[PDB]
Structures are given as C-alpha cells and as structure tokens.
Design a protein around this ligand. Structure first.
Ligand SMILES: *[C@@H]1O[C@@H](C)[C@@H](O)[C@@H](O)[C@@H]1O
Ligand SMILES: *[C@@H]1O[C@@H](C)[C@@H](O)[C@@H](O)[C@@H]1O
Ligand SMILES: [Ca+2]
Ligand SMILES: [Ca+2]
Ligand SMILES: [Ca+2]
Ligand SMILES: [Ca+2]
Ligand SMILES: [Ca+2]
Ligand SMILES: [Ca+2]
Ligand SMILES: [Ca+2]
Lengths: 122, 122
C-alpha cells in the first residue's frame, strides 16, 4: 500500500482531511465542500432559497439572503408588518403594504398618520 | 319725507336692516354683505387666503380652506410634521416630507420604520 496522505501534496482539496486506506484513500471534507476530493464548493443558492426578489449569497457551508425593502427573515419570506408599531394616531385603521402602510382615519381626523384634528373646524 | 323702510319692499337686500332718514335712507348690512343696499355678497376668497393649492370656499361672512394632503391650518399654511409622533423606531432619524416621512435607521436596523433587527444576522 501507498499512503496517499503522506505524499508531497494533500490529495484532498479545500483543506479536507486525508484518510489513508489499504489500496486507496478517502477525504473528509470541510462543511460546504463536496466530491471525492472535496473539489466542489456546494452552491447553497442552487434551489433558490431567497424569496421575493432577494439576493442569495453563496457562501462556504451556507447561504445568506439580502432582502428587498419590506421583506425580512432568513429566506426573505416575511412581509414586514409596518402596522405592528401602531403608527396611525386616533385609532386609525392601519393597512399594511410593501415597505409602506396606509391609515384610514376616523371622522374628524386626517393626514397620513391621522395627526390633523378637524373637530374644531366642524 | 317718504319712509323708504315702510314701503312694499325692504330696499335693503340680503335681510339688511332698513333705516329711514330725512330725504333718504340707509342699510345696515348683515356680516358678509356690502353695497348701499347690501347687494354684494363679499368674496372672502378674492385675496387668495388658502395656501399650497388649497380650495377656498367663499361663504357668508367668511372663507374656509380645504387643504391638500400634508397641509393644515386656517390658511393651509402649515406643512404637517409627520415626524411629530416619532414613527421611526430605534432612534431612527425622521425626515419630514409632504404627507409622508422617511426614516434613516441606525446600524443594525432597516425597513420603513426601522422595525427590522439585523443584529443577530451580523
Ligand atoms: C441583491 O440584493 C437584492 C436586495 C436586490 O437588490 C437584487 O437585485 C441584488 O442583486
Ligand atoms: C379643492 O380642494 C383642494 C384640496 C384641491 O383638491 C382642489 O383642486 C379643489 O378644487
Ligand atoms: Ca492507500
Ligand atoms: Ca458554497
Ligand atoms: Ca408590509
Ligand atoms: Ca409612510
Ligand atoms: Ca326717507
Ligand atoms: Ca361671501
Ligand atoms: Ca410634512
């Protein structure tokens, strides 16, 4: 037997661990590397994990998503609820949109956030 | 002398008060009426009191302004401060616009209202 893990070069790529066997050898790859000699940097983005027009970053052993505005979450799968902070004053009904919200104001109030009091006028 | 205030018709228009004089008469007009016999409904809008593309209503003895969105006040002269209610979360800097606002979020926060916490990701 030749110990392939004790020759001039490590036959395993991307710093995989070489393990000698009788008649051959094997590679123990670092996370994110595949192939008999760890030759392939796995594409973690190949199944399109990033949703809603997000950008997928293909990294070592992982992906990361960069979300479009209005979206959040590991997969950009959550439409952020802009109504969650109750931005509409005076019990205005908050309507959630994409990176935006609308307020439907009760009688006597107007403006984007229902700020403007009209009661004195009428 | 003829009492012009005791003839068939009141010579004063728009329910003005007729006052007899010796040789003539005079009219005491209701508010918002002008002319010797109160013939003219004053145009309270003639000097354009309603600002910022507002609609002026020419009324009896008064005007009223209907403001464009983002404006308030008797003359629609006030640009409503949408930042007044502190809509930006996490000490985001609020920039006032017309019937709208923008948030400039601090490091680690994003979204229209700085809602989205990125600290765990980075
Ligand atoms: C990656 O980032 C996201 C947010 C989008 O702007 C994409 O177009 C870009 O490639
Ligand atoms: C009167 O109302 C204001 C708010 C504007 O919409 C004008 O165009 C209208 O005549
Ligand atoms: Ca061997
Ligand atoms: Ca990868
Ligand atoms: Ca939303
Ligand atoms: Ca808004
Ligand atoms: Ca007279
Ligand atoms: Ca008038
Ligand atoms: Ca404003």
């Amino acid at each position: 037997d030749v110990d392939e893990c004790s020759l001039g070069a490590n036959p395993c790529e991307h710093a995989g661990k070489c393990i000698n066997t009788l008649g051959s050898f094997e590679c123990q790859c670092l996370q994110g590397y595949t192939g008999p000699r760890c030759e392939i940097d796995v594409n973690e983005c190949v199944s399109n994990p990033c949703q809603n027009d997000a950008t997928c970053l293909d990294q070592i052993g992982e992906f990361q998503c960069i979300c479009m505005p209005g979206y959040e979450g590991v997969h950009c799968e959550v439409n952020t609820d802009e109504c969650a902070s109750s931005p509409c004053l005076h019990n205005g009904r908050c309507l959630d949109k994409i990176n935006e919200f609308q307020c439907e104001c009760p009688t006597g109030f107007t403006g984007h956030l229902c700020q403007v009091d009209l009661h004195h006028i009428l």
